[PDB]
Design a protein around this ligand. Structure first.
Ligand SMILES: CCCCCCCCCCCCC/C=C\[C@H](O)[C@H](N)CO
Ligand SMILES: CCCCCCCCCCCCC/C=C\[C@H](O)[C@H](N)CO
Lengths: 48, 97, 245, 297, 245, 297, 49
């Protein structure tokens, strides 16, 4: 969760709204296990 | 690091680029909420847009720490402070900061 | 390599890009009580990460005609977290503090705040104005919690002592051209190695605008101030039922 | 039996007080060194940051061209020993014949040295003080006339029984300390130890001494440290009958072996009550005097 | 030098004059989690005296037609003390236990109780009697707190498993001619080094009269049983807001 | 940085598991020693205290007059390796042509080995188990007739997509493991690892898996360990059309490298449901059979 | 903006304990990820059509 600690302060002239871009990754201690087949992508049949 | 699209609100074609950045306007200073998202990579949500969230679909069990990097895309004269909290399990949605 | 800081204690982390430095109060770091200095024989519980961590109280808005606010310690953390339950469940208490005050504004705003730590900040009354009544302040005003209380007469700090000489205690200054944080590290200050968190307050935290905030309209008129504070080297002793006051 | 690394590598239980400072001998004022012109870049000893909260580390060797001055001025008069070892009035008791205050040949005076502004403001500069003392009792008539009268000065600590009259049985001073004097003789003078249960007295107690709900009824407890209530000083005219000389005892206290902690802002407003930092909010006075214009003196 | 015991842990102390001995469960003493076995990286709080101490739950009356009672662990201590606040404020939990059961009676009373520790005491239902309904037990009955719950069918322990073979788990027997206490020391039992105290219960404590209480009228007809239990080697990890269930 | 004595003298952080016991080699039964008459006082090896909760440490050397017997009986058949490495029925799947269960050429069977009482009661003797396994698929017609048919045995772990029909695109088994067999050939037999996120399976979970309020609506969650849900085993008739042979697949599981913890009382009442220790409370049966009198056999 | 990823740790951002990780990286190899026989083609030899 992301909360306004103080505020988004801006002077005259600069735009009163901005955007934040999130960038997710993992670390050197990350590990995966027990390979399966993916589920959050499916396919309509009849390729070509 | 690849883009975790928190703002998964739009559905139409033109606004699929709106889905990669979430806004930060000026508020009334009462410690409001900006955004919230689950920390579950294999679950259907913001992480499906990440390589981690697509390779973890090819695996069934995962273990380890995660990184989330937020970059401010505003003016140089813009300034502010935000609180990015991680609420462990058991924790319901917090109603306040 | 001075205007940036990362204060990491426990499961919390404060980053700063526009710092001045860290003040260590009276040149002493927080510590635990020796066996020479101790008197109580009970073995104290020393929870090291569940209470030694940053808590965030509430926000106060720096308007043009703001006069000041004070927060009494450790009244701020007696209804908040695992700290404020042990303080209820125990009779004694001993901790230092790391106070952190945030006020961010543009490069077109201007103003200054004095952020001071005054030990044993006893509160006075106006005596009805005339000076005849031996009135006393209420509990709302003596110990006001984490929502703080505003000063009516900030020149005398509502105790008859002047604001000018308050820089003999710990202090930093938040000058919006120069900084937006103020870090003060306070040790435990008392005549006693231990005391109760619910009756005695060790010090007060004064936040006073010496220079008035000014901006031209078009800018953002809402400039909050947020207090963020960590216990350090905390100790508890004397276990009984939980009492609030 | 410590095995995990989260407890071997710990700083919990570190009782040593880590200090950034070191007290060094300063018997004399700092001497001045010879200084020349500097016409360089990078180093700017006049530009400071008071935002850090620290004070200016500048010199006059860095800011003007100075000469070698050997300072032989002593720092020995700013010690607490010299500043506080000066006997001042802390109390004043009247034993009249008639009236309303003490018309019955005895008087009890609860010890607080915060009834006269001259010694109060000088100790209220600090928050904690630990000292021995020397009390001195200057007894006389309102007119200053000295008379042939015998008095008894009893110290009644807490818990001990206060005397209800002149012929009460507490004056027998079997375990309580007492002093007998004639007024034709010099003033009495006793030395006193540090008698508190705490490591120091404290003139400001931010809190309440009793537990429980805090209402408007018992709101007068705010600020009361019982670690400072050293008791009661009683005084009578030794006799089974009424005296004929009215009397006034003045008490003059002098500190010794002083230690003090945590300086405070000195008070600029007038005291109104004892053990209470109240002020008249209608008549707030500045801590200085005024001008009419900032450009004109 | 066996029928007397003094169990001292923390600020509590149980004296016994008519003990049997102390049972140590599965031959392991309670301990802390190694770095080999751990997975969570957070530093756990180890409060050593504020939660490792004896708590006293409530009393159950051994009447003639008593059937038995069970208490699920650590549900007994989630609304009680500094233990039950840390368990709310944290997500994980790891502790052993020292259970102590008291039942004092004369030398003219007679009876026996089986005091057993059954791990993962999953509760069953009567299936409506017929055996057709896949009914499930309520939350009142699964996790009943410190007031416990009474058994309806104690032969099968309300799970279809017989009381006779329950002495393969930990147990002591309170024979009123021989003893009036039963001390069982339990380690942490789980497949995982840590688990949540509010969802998962590690074991159950069964108290069952195998022999019925008997006395001739004239004596005292009220014979209570009191459960007295201490956490041991407790550890907590994963700090967030307090949640009750 | 540890300085106080309340933390140097501590046992906090003692991760070593202090045990009272020691496993010693017992390849054979204990031998018997020669024993004589004892006619002494003080020592009474027949009088015990079961109130301690321990078992009798008595012998026959202490209670009768015995001879030297060299026991050469092996303890090798009571191992868990021998007791559990015996392939038993854990599942049975039918692929009929018509009907109500699976009339569409495919069938999914969620793995629980608690559907047949013979292997359930044998594993539910323990609380925790950690084992590899060997599954074996014996496919045939209801009549036992063997037929020339090709099958596909797909393992669908959790998260992976379950197949909705026979011609679904999950059967392509790109990352999922699958097996193809003819029924004219022997039964398939694959070996399996320990696949749980925990250090062991557990047949009894005393608690709820999800947080939140626990009402009568979602009360079926009580006892569900997702650390045991290893997924789904699917089976189809490989084809684009309807088969003509009805089929029944029987699954026979055999453990290897077994470890187990915390024995339990064995069940004496009849199972009624899967993953649920419920019973018929009206028809409670004793765990034995009865007599008419205790003095008469 | 550098295009690189965060070199941060949890040792630098929270207070952590010594964890000895014995989890293997052997299942994310390409050998394990691709050595799984999957359908690449399907040919029909009907009688008519
Ligand atoms: C024979 C008579 C001897 C009299 C001795 C009197 C003992 C007094 C000891 C000094 C006490 C220090 C002053 C007391 C504390 C403070 O003034 C107030 N109680 C708190 O505001
Ligand atoms: C090609 C097909 C291979 C099929 C492999 C199946 C994997 C099954 C692994 C064994 C799982 C152990 C039994 C499961 C746990 C328990 O029976 C229940 N889920 C809990 O009551």
């Amino acid at each position: 969760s992301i909360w306004y600690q103080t505020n988004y302060v801006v002077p005259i002239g600069a735009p009163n709204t901005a955007y934040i871009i999130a960038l997710a990754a993992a670390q050197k201690n990350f590990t995966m296990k027990l390979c399966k087949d993916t589920s959050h992508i499916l396919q309509t049949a009849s390729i070509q | 690091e690849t883009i975790l699209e928190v703002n998964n609100v739009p559905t139409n074609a033109t606004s699929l680029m709106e889905r990669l950045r979430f806004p930060v306007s000026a508020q009334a200073g009462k410690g409001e909420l900006c955004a919230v998202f689950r920390a579950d990579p294999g679950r259907d949500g913001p992480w499906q847009s990440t390589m981690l969230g697509q390779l973890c679909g090819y695996y069934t069990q995962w273990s380890g720490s995660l990184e989330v990097t937020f970059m401010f895309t505003g003016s140089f004269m813009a300034t502010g402070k935000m609180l990015i909290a991680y609420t462990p399990p058991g924790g319901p949605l917090p109603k306040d900061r | 390599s001075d205007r940036v800081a990362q204060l990491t204690i426990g499961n919390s982390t404060i980053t700063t890009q526009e710092a001045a430095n860290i003040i260590v109060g009276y040149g002493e770091w927080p510590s635990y009580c020796s066996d020479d200095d101790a008197t109580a024989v009970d073995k104290p519980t020393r929870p090291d990460v569940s209470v030694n961590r940053f808590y965030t109280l509430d926000t106060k808005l720096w308007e043009k005609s703001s006069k000041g606010w004070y927060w009494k310690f450790p009244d701020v953390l007696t209804e908040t977290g695992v700290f404020g339950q042990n303080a209820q469940f125990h009779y004694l208490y001993r901790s230092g503090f790391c106070i952190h005050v945030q006020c961010n504004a543009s490069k077109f705003h201007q103003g200054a705040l004095l952020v001071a730590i005054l030990p044993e900040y006893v509160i006075g009354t106006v005596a009805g104005g005339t000076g005849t009544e031996d009135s006393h302040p209420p509990y709302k005003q003596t110990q006001p919690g984490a929502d703080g209380f505003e000063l009516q007469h900030p020149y005398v700090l509502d105790a008859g002592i002047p604001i000018s000489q308050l820089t003999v205690c710990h202090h930093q200054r938040i000058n919006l051209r120069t900084n937006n944080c103020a870090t003060i590290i306070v040790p435990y200050m008392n005549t006693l190695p231990f005391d109760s968190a619910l009756n005695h307050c060790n010090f007060g935290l004064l936040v006073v605008p010496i220079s008035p905030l000014d901006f031209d309209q078009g800018a953002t008129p809402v400039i909050p101030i947020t207090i963020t504070l960590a216990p350090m080297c905390s100790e508890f002793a004397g276990l009984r039922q939980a009492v609030t006051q | 039996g410590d095995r995990v690394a989260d407890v071997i590598e710990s700083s919990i239980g570190d009782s040593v007080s880590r200090a950034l400072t070191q007290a060094l001998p300063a018997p004399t004022g700092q001497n001045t060194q010879v200084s020349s012109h500097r016409l360089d870049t990078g180093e700017v000893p006049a530009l400071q940051a008071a935002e850090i909260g620290a004070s200016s580390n500048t010199s006059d060797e860095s800011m003007i061209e100075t000469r070698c001055v050997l300072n032989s001025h002593s720092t020995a008069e700013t010690t607490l020993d010299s500043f506080f070892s000066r006997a001042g009035l802390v109390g004043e008791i009247d034993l009249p014949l008639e009236g309303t205050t003490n018309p019955n040949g005895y008087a009890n005076w609860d010890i607080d040295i915060t009834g006269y502004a001259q010694m109060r403001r000088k100790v209220e500069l600090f928050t904690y003080m630990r000292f021995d003392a020397e009390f001195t009792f200057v007894a006389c008539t309102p007119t200053g006339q000295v008379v042939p009268q015998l008095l008894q000065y009893m110290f009644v600590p807490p818990g001990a029984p206060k005397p209800e009259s002149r012929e009460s049985l507490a004056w027998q001073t079997a375990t309580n300390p007492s002093v007998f004097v004639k007024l034709t003789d010099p003033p009495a003078q006793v030395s006193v130890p540090f008698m508190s249960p705490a490591s120091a007295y404290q003139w400001f107690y931010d809190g309440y001494p009793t537990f429980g709900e805090h209402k408007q009824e018992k709101d007068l407890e705010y600020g009361a440290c019982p670690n400072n209530m050293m008791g009661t000083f009683s005084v009578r005219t030794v006799g089974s009958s009424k005296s004929k000389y009215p009397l006034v005892v003045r008490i003059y206290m002098r500190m010794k072996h002083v230690r003090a902690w945590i300086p405070r802002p000195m008070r600029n407003q007038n005291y109104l009550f004892k053990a209470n930092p109240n002020y008249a909010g209608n008549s707030i006075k500045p801590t200085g005097t005024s001008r009419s214009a900032i450009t004109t003196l």
